[PDB]
């Protein structure tokens, strides 16, 4: 019982971490485009 509940919690944490991950990727690419504009 506990094993499965813990796995479900780990899945929810996975979901949150992925959300944060591609959010950070978006921020990265935004700053990167800004970097290229500043280089230009």
């Amino acid at each position: 019982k506990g094993q499965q509940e813990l796995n479900l919690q780990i899945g929810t944490e996975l979901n949150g971490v992925n959300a944060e991950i591609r959010k950070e990727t978006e921020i990265q690419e935004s700053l990167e485009g800004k970097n290229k504009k500043f280089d230009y």
């Binding site: 094993q3 921020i27 970097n35």
Partner: peptide, 29 residues
């Protein structure tokens, strides 16, 4: 059950590290 729990935990850790590294890189940019 057990092994899937451990695998999910581990992968979650590595993706958290990826998140933290992306945060470092965004800050540095």
């Amino acid at each position: 059950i057990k092994i899937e729990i451990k695998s999910n935990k581990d992968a979650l850790e590595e993706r958290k590290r990826i998140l933290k590294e992306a945060k470092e890189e965004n800050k540095r940019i």
